[PDB]
Every structure is written in structure tokens, then in C-alpha cells.
Amino acid sequence: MAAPLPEGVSAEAMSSALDRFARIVGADWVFTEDKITPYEDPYTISNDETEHRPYAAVAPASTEEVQEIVRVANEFGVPLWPVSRGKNFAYGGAAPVMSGTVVLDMNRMNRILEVNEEFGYALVEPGVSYFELYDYIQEKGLKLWIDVPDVGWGSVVGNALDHGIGYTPYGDHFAMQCGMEVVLPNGEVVRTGMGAMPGNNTWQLFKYGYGPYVDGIFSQSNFGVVTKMGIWLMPEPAGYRPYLITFENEDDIETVTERLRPLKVAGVIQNGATVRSLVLDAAITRTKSQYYDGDGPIPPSVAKTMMADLDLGMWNFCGALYGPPPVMDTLWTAIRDSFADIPGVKFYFPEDRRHKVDLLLHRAETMKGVPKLTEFNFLNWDGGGGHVGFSPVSPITGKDAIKQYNMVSSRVREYGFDYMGLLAIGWRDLHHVTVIVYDKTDPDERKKLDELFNILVDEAAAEGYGEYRTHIRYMDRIAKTYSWNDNALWKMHETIKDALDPNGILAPGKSGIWGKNRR
Amino acid sequence: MAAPLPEGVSAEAMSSALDRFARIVGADWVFTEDKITPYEDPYTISNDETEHRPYAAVAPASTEEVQEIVRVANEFGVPLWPVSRGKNFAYGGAAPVMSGTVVLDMNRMNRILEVNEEFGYALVEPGVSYFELYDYIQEKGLKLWIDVPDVGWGSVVGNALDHGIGYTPYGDHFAMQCGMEVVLPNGEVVRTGMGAMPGNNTWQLFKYGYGPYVDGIFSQSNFGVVTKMGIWLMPEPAGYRPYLITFENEDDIETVTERLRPLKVAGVIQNGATVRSLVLDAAITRTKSQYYDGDGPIPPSVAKTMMADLDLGMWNFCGALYGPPPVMDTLWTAIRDSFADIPGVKFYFPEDRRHKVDLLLHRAETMKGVPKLTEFNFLNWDGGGGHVGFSPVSPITGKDAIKQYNMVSSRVREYGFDYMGLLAIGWRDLHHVTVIVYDKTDPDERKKLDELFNILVDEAAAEGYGEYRTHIRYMDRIAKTYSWNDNALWKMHETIKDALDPNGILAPGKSGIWGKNRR
Numbered sequence A, B: 001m002a003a004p005l006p007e008g009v010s011a012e013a014m015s016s017a018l019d020r021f022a023r024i025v026g027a028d029w030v031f032t033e034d035k036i037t038p039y040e041d042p043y044t045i046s047n048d049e050t051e052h053r054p055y056a057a058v059a060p061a062s063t064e065e066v067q068e069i070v071r072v073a074n075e076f077g078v079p080l081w082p083v084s085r086g087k088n089f090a091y092g093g094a095a096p097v098m099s100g101t102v103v104l105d106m107n108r109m110n111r112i113l114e115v116n117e118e119f120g121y122a123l124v125e126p127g128v129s130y131f132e133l134y135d136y137i138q139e140k141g142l143k144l145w146i147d148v149p150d151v152g153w154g155s156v157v158g159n160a161l162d163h164g165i166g167y168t169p170y171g172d173h174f175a176m177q178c179g180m181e182v183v184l185p186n187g188e189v190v191r192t193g194m195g196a197m198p199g200n201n202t203w204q205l206f207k208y209g210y211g212p213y214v215d216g217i218f219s220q221s222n223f224g225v226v227t228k229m230g231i232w233l234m235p236e237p238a239g240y241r242p243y244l245i246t247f248e249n250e251d252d253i254e255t256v257t258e259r260l261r262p263l264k265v266a267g268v269i270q271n272g273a274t275v276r277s278l279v280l281d282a283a284i285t286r287t288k289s290q291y292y293d294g295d296g297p298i299p300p301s302v303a304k305t306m307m308a309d310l311d312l313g314m315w316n317f318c319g320a321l322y323g324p325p326p327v328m329d330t331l332w333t334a335i336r337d338s339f340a341d342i343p344g345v346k347f348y349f350p351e352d353r354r355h356k357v358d359l360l361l362h363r364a365e366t367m368k369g370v371p372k373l374t375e376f377n378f379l380n381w382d383g384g385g386g387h388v389g390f391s392p393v394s395p396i397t398g399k400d401a402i403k404q405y406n407m408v409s410s411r412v413r414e415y416g417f418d419y420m421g422l423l424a425i426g427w428r429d430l431h432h433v434t435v436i437v438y439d440k441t442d443p444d445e446r447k448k449l450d451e452l453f454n455i456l457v458d459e460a461a462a463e464g465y466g467e468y469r470t471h472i473r474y475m476d477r478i479a480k481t482y483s484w485n486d487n488a489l490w491k492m493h494e495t496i497k498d499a500l501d502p503n504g505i506l507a508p509g510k511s512g513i514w515g516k517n518r519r
């Protein structure tokens, strides 16, 4: 079933806009009909084939083409969904919230404008992948690391703008951003920070520049199209020691989170702390069929086999030490002593692991910024599928951690899915992350998934736990949880949207923000 | 001599507003006539007495009184100048850009709403001083440090919003901000981040919340009135070692900046690096008259007597080590060895300083977040004066440091002032900071000051060095240096200003931002 037209746009307006788009980028860089397939969400949730359907895609080569495209979108009221590389799998891929939206795919704007070793930064266009930035650095022998999600075909820009995370000390991608160029919804171009100063050499050295700090308003946003972005890069460290701490009991997560709190608040653990459930970690190297025959989620007897077999606990804390050995030894003493008295705890460094293909060896690559695509193998746990996550924010306490594990594993298993969870800590923020793998081809699984997801959001919100990043299908739902003072915050986002984008042509419904023409 | 009415506002409109303000906050907290004196800039620059003249001040007790004052302001078209404590000495104090603006003084809103030890944060109203928050922490025995901008009587909120800086690893005050409550220009109230979720306990734990990141637009801004603000607080570390490294030769600053760069990018130096000129450091414990009776800048023979008398160099680098001894020793080895081979270099710890009142003993207090008013001593160098500062951003290069030292020291000395200066480094950002001490009572000195200041701006901008914070007199002048693409960035600020504040009643001219009614 073909995408419907966006409401308020005629066949003739759409036909005219797509031909005008083709005059700007070339007929070969406007995609309709059979060539739209890759812009669909690969992990379908809806059973309604009229939802989240991109009408076409346009793939520009430059900021100047983006500006022209934006002006044509305003001329015809044809809305655009900007993507850097459009690999936002688990969140909708390249697909828009509103059917009939045209994808603006900036994949071909893939110039690495600068990599600066002595100041540790890069200035990149949206099409630059983590693979590409990593290869450039390696090729040029620069003593810099990148910070990669578990998945390396993504965008250094796109991932950061969606408040993406990785597994080095530079793991908060948007916090490491510094300077951007934006095409505003009127088609005019602006630079933030020191980029506003002609002849500056400081665009990537100082975030604020002068006056209001606005870079943030173009993250998780439909206020602009980002065409260049700076990012800080970690200088190669004097040493690197990745580790795995395993815990034998499901209830250990309570005391583990209590012990993690001071180590994370003080910065003794130098990267994000990630504590993964047994099945989430097993799914890298194993399938359910190799330990259990049921079509249901696993029983506890299986869990015990997997633990001894894979040298994993019910909870698996991956982290890493960075810097000269005397620093790494001192921090390690602090971290190890924090967990040594827990019955059944085990400590591993890479040389301590007895398997060739191993969770610590796999996570050790990500914790030093090596981009890969091996993480997608976890989707084969239950025969093959898509994934979606729920990652709300809570205080770093044992009580909050065990409450979420209990609430979520209960609900997920009620709907026929194995519980795959982790407790993640950035700095002062805990996230219980629910990872759900589903057969996206099965209408009944899709219906169960949607119904489950809505229960997780509601029960989390009732405890004061709010989502920070979500799939196109739930962007309205998450926005409505942020309801303080009768939705005061979204009223302010709406005022800013109407000011910058009076015709509502950028990404209708992104982050639950809709302009005056569609509200 | 009395302040003029703001243009467009009648005596009747003003008198009605003031009558309504008195009923909102009480007659004892609307200040007119003789009681306006404290709201004048204490360090006058302009010789035109009709400039930067507040008409009156209102001191509300609560967010509800702020909302009512803002609605009254919209009713009568009376503009407001929001200050948290108005201690912005060197930037115009509590005085507005535009004469006849009424000061909205929130010093009486001084509740410490929360200090959380296990998560290391505070939630504060704008009237909370560094002195008050430090005294609160000390009395309850909480193992937390604050970060002070050497001006104990200032606002935790107000300083952060103006992008203020201190001397611990938490020195970027606005970077450590997390959650705020803002009264918007229509008098409606909003909470950013996790504060938009009813029942959250995460407002001070996670900056972003969901959707666009907007806290930044209320910093160095007239988009809103901040009434509550969270800030991250450093856990008391396992150890603290403040140090002073002196350089004999003014030309040493070139090689010193070169060696500082990798140490700062990599985080081996854990706080801001501050490299202060002889006179700036000497003026802390001595006056010019102790060494030289002439009215001109000191000569070189006097500089050398001062260096020998005080154990100071032409350049004085104060920094501190934080954390467990084995970490501090490792970082000290790298820092020490970076400078050991410079002829004339000297290394001091507190126990190495002979003088009882001593640069390093005062700086050691600031670099562990002990609030003081010691820093004001440099105003007595030439018998008593005010100060203004020029603090543009540059790359951390010897060539940029020595260029700025030569082009500024020559000009300031040319106009008859002693050069007092420093090279400060945040993380990747160099600042050559010019401190100009002048007789604020003397119209001739004021005129030489204004002339010198304008030359320093133009010569800096010609090199691509832009200011990040300035005095109310120069806010339009600095805005105009950020002129990339025919002033694109300020056209965007103006679009947001007109959307949030259609009647232009918040702080007209803050950061060179004027609404449509005044532009």
C-alpha cells in the first residue's frame, strides 16, 4: 500500500514539489515508488499500513541544495523529515511520524571538514559515519579516539542530535558537541558559538560564544536542519584496561546500584557504567534454541546453565580504566573494593576470559571507540526480529533499580518476550533500559508489543520515571508525560516552532512538537 | 541627574505600574529617589549621566510575586532588568543597558530548596549567595564543595546565567547547571528537563529531559526570569594540593601556553589553568606606592624589586591537584616535567611560601571553593578604583598568547594604566583577560578607558578573537562582532525574542537583543 499524501497537500502540489526537488539535486537523487523501501522503519510496530509512511526522499549534495529544498517545501507546504544517515533503527529508522512527509537524506554530505589532533576535535557534515571518521583518523595516524554507539554505520551528527550515547569518557555525544551550522525553516543559514565571528579559529574550542546558548534547541528538534557540527574527541590515553564484574543473583542489582552511586558521582568510574542482564549479554554469542526448546521466555534452570557456560552472572557490569597505569591501578582498587564482599561476585580482565568469542572481548572494542556491526547479532536470540527500547531516567538507588527490574521483567514476560534489561549510569542519572526483540513481520507480535510499550510508559510515569529518547510512534505519548503546569514546556516549544517554522515544513511531530497548522 | 522615563512610557503608565508593584511586594520593597543609589553601576564608565540609569527597583519575595510583576510590566509597557543579587561589578552591577528600565531584584528569594549529598547537587533561588550556600553546607557537615567566582557575595544563579567561572574542576558554572524554573515574558511559569514531569526526583540528575534542550536560551538572555536553578556540586575529594609555578620572563608565556595545551585537552590539569601577570598578583598584598611614587605605569626595575620582594614572576600559574595521593603524584609528575626546563621557573606548594599574606594562600582557598572578598584588594593598586575586563576567546597557542599579551599590554600602558592580565584556560579555550583598574570618579580617566576598550575590541576582532561576556555599555558592540552572514545569529535571537516577549518588557538590550518595538 503506497504512502498517502500529507493532509493539506494536493497531488498537483506534491508532483510539482518533487519535480522542483529533482531540478535542485538531480532526478537520480529523488526516490519514489520502489526506491522508498529503505526509508520505511525496518522494525514495523503499527498494524495500520497508513502510519509512519514516507512519501519520497531527496538526497542533497550540499548546504546550498538543502537551502533550495527547504524554500521549495515552504512554497508547496510539503513537510520534510531531516536525517543525517537515517540509521535510527529501534527509533523508526528514516521514517517520519506523519505519513506523507518527504525524507531529506543528507547521506551524500559526507565531508570530514577538519580533524584537529592538538585541540582534539572534528568538524563534520551529517553523512559522516563513525566507520568513516575512525578510518580517516587511523589512515592519518592521529592520536585520537572516537566515541561510538554499539553500531558504527550511524551518523556522528544524527546520533548526537538524538542525544545518543557511547561507552568511553566521551559517551554523552551531545555534551561533546561544539559549534553547528543550521539551515532554519525559512532556508537561511546560521552558525552558533564562535562560528558567528568571521575569521574565528575557535568554533570547536568554546561552546557558548556570546549571548543565548541555542545549540541545544536543534537537538531532538524540528527547529532546524543541521548541516555542519563540531565534536570534541578524546586524546589517545596512556593506557586502557576494560573489565567485567559479574553478579550471580537477580536481587544483587539493589546493592550493586548503591555501590555504583558514589563511584559515578565522584568520576572514579571514568565511562558510563552499564550493568546488563544475562539474556541481553548471552544474545551476542548465543541463541535461545541452544539452551531451551519452548516458544515462551526461558525458565530459571536454563539461566543457571548459561551462567556457568558463558562465565556470566544474572547481572554483568562492563566498564573500563583509562590513563597511565598508576591512575588505572588506584581507580581499580576503589572499584573492586566496592564490590568484593558481595557473595558470588567475579572480576575479569580480557586475559581472564576462557572463550575465543566472548562478551568482555566484544564490549572492550566499543569502550575504546572501535566501530562495528556485530551488536545486531543479538536480534537472533528468538529466531530473528527488530528491537525497541524504553530508557527512562531515575535516581541512582538500589530501591529504584530493583523496583524497575521487578516492574518491567514481569510485564515483558506477561506478553511472551524474554526480559533483556540493563541499568546504565551516565554521571548522576540511572536508566533502567528495557530492550524488547520482536518478530516485526507478525501482526499479533506487533499488537502485543504496542500494548506492552504503553503499559511500560504509564507505570514508569506513575513512579516519576520519564523517557529521554523514543520511537516515532511514541513521540506524542512521551511528550504528554512532561505535563507540569498544564503542559507549559510543550506550549513554549510550540511558540518557538511557530516563530522559526510558520509554515510547519520541518519534521511534524518530532518530540511531540506540531506547529499551528497541524495542532 | 534623576533617571529619565524609558522612551514610549508616560509618567502615568510608570506611576500606575509602580503603584501596582507596591501592592504585589509591599511599599517597603519598591525603591525610588535616594534608595535607587545601590542599583547604579558602582564603576561608572559613561560621562553621559542620562545612560544606564535604572528608574526604580522592585524586590519580590516569591515566584508568584515575580509572575504578577511581569503581568503588570506587560499591562503598562514598563521594561524590567532581572538580577539574582545584582553583584555584577565590572559588568555594570545591577544597572540596565537602557535608562528608565526598572530593576527586578530577587535577592530576597534566597531559599536553599535542597542540598543533596549522595547525588551532589543543590536547588537554589536567585538570592542564595556563595557565602550562604557554603555556610549551609559547613553547618550541616555535608561532604560537598561549591565553586566560587572569587566573589562570595554573588549569586549561584546569576553568575551561572552570565556564563561565570570559578577555580575548581566545577569551574564552568553554567555547564554544572541542571534544571531551572523560568517565568516567561507573559508571566507564565515553565520547568526545563525532568522538572516538566510531575513526581520526578531527577530534575537535578539529568540535564536534557526530552525534546529540545532549551536551558541555554535563558543564559546571557532576556527570554525569561529564572526563579529556581539546580547546580551540580563536587563531592569532597580524597585530597587537595594547590600549587604556584612562577616564570621570570614576560616572553615565557609563549612556551608556557604551548606546554599548557596538551595538559588541559587531556585533563591532566583538573581545574582552570590561571596564569596571572605580576601586577595582578602583587596588587593582592601590596599597592603601587610601596614601590613607585610616579603616576605612570611601573618601569622594569620596579617589576624586578616586586618579583624579589614577593617571590612572584612576570607570569604566575596557579592550579590544584585533586583526589587520592597516588593520582595527585602522577599528575604532578607530568605538570612539573612540562615546565622544569624553562630557565628561571620556580615551583611552590603552600608550605614553600614565606609571606604570611600570600598569593598562593588566597588562591588555595578559591581552588577548593572557599568564598572570600580578598580579590577586591587589586582595586587599591593605585589608591582605589573600579575595574572593567576584556576576555576574548582564542586557541591555546603560544603564538596567540604572546600576540594578545603584546597587543594589549602596549595599548593599556599607552593610555596610562598598569597592565594587569592573565591567560586562563577552561578546557580547549584560551582567554587573554585584560583587567583595567581606573578612577571611576574622574571623567578624564573614564574617557581614556572607553577609548582604550573600543580599540581592544576592534583589534581583537580583526584577529578573530571574540568576547564571551561584557559590561552593559558594550553589549551592542560585542553582538555586532558576531556578524557571520549579515548578522544571521542575532536575526534568529530577535525572532525568538519577538515570539517569547512580544511587548519587549524583559531587559531590553541584554546581549544586544532588542525586540521589534525598539530595534
Ligand SMILES: Cc1cc2nc3c(=O)[nH]c(=O)nc-3n(C[C@H](O)[C@H](O)[C@H](O)COP(=O)(O)OP(=O)(O)OC[C@H]3O[C@@H](n4cnc5c(N)ncnc54)[C@H](O)[C@@H]3O)c2cc1C
Pocket: A082, A083, A084, A085, A086, A087, A088, A089, A090, A093, A094, A106, A126, A148, A149, A150, A151, A153, A154, A155, A156, A157, A158, A159, A161, A162, A163, A164, A165, A166, A221, A224, A225, A226, A227, A375, A376, A387, A507, A510
Ligand atoms: C542493536 C542496536 C544497538 C544500538 N546501540 C546504540 C547505542 O549504543 N547508542 C545509541 O545512542 N544508539 C544506539 N542504537 C540506536 C540507533 O540505531 C543509533 O543511535 C544510530 O546511530 C542512529 O541513527 P543515525 O546515527 O543514522 O542518526 P539519524 O537517523 O541520521 O538521526 C536520528 C534523528 O535525529 C534527527 N536528525 C538527524 N540528523 C538531523 C539533522 N541534520 N538536522 C536535524 N535533525 C536531524 C532526526 O529526527 C532523525 O530521525 C542502537 C540500535 C540497535 C538496533
Ligand SMILES: Cc1cc2nc3c(=O)[nH]c(=O)nc-3n(C[C@H](O)[C@H](O)[C@H](O)COP(=O)(O)OP(=O)(O)OC[C@H]3O[C@@H](n4cnc5c(N)ncnc54)[C@H](O)[C@@H]3O)c2cc1C
Pocket: B082, B083, B084, B085, B086, B087, B088, B089, B090, B093, B094, B106, B126, B148, B149, B150, B151, B153, B154, B155, B156, B157, B158, B159, B161, B162, B163, B164, B165, B166, B221, B224, B225, B226, B227, B375, B376, B387, B507, B510
Ligand atoms: C574584583 C572582581 C573579581 C571578580 N571575579 C570574578 C570571577 O572570578 N569569576 C566571575 O565569573 N566573575 C567575577 N567577577 C564579576 C562579578 O562580580 C561576578 O561574576 C558576580 O558573581 C556576578 O553578580 P551576581 O552573581 O550577583 O549576578 P547578577 O548580577 O544577579 O546577574 C548577572 C546578570 O545575569 C542576568 N540574570 C541574573 N539573574 C537572572 C535571572 N534570575 N533571570 C534572568 N537573568 C538573570 C542579568 O542580565 C544580570 O545582570 C568579578 C568582579 C570583580 C570586580
Ligand SMILES: [Cl-]
Pocket: A113
Ligand atoms: Cl567550514
Ligand SMILES: [Cl-]
Pocket: A504, A505, A506, A507, A508, A509, A513, A514, A515, A516, A518
Ligand atoms: Cl508541524
Ligand SMILES: [Cl-]
Pocket: B113
Ligand atoms: Cl521546589
Ligand SMILES: [Cl-]
Pocket: A266, B236, B237, B238, B239, B322, B323, B324
Ligand atoms: Cl576522589
Ligand SMILES: [Cl-]
Pocket: B504, B505, B506, B507, B508, B509, B513, B514, B515, B516, B518
Ligand atoms: Cl526589548
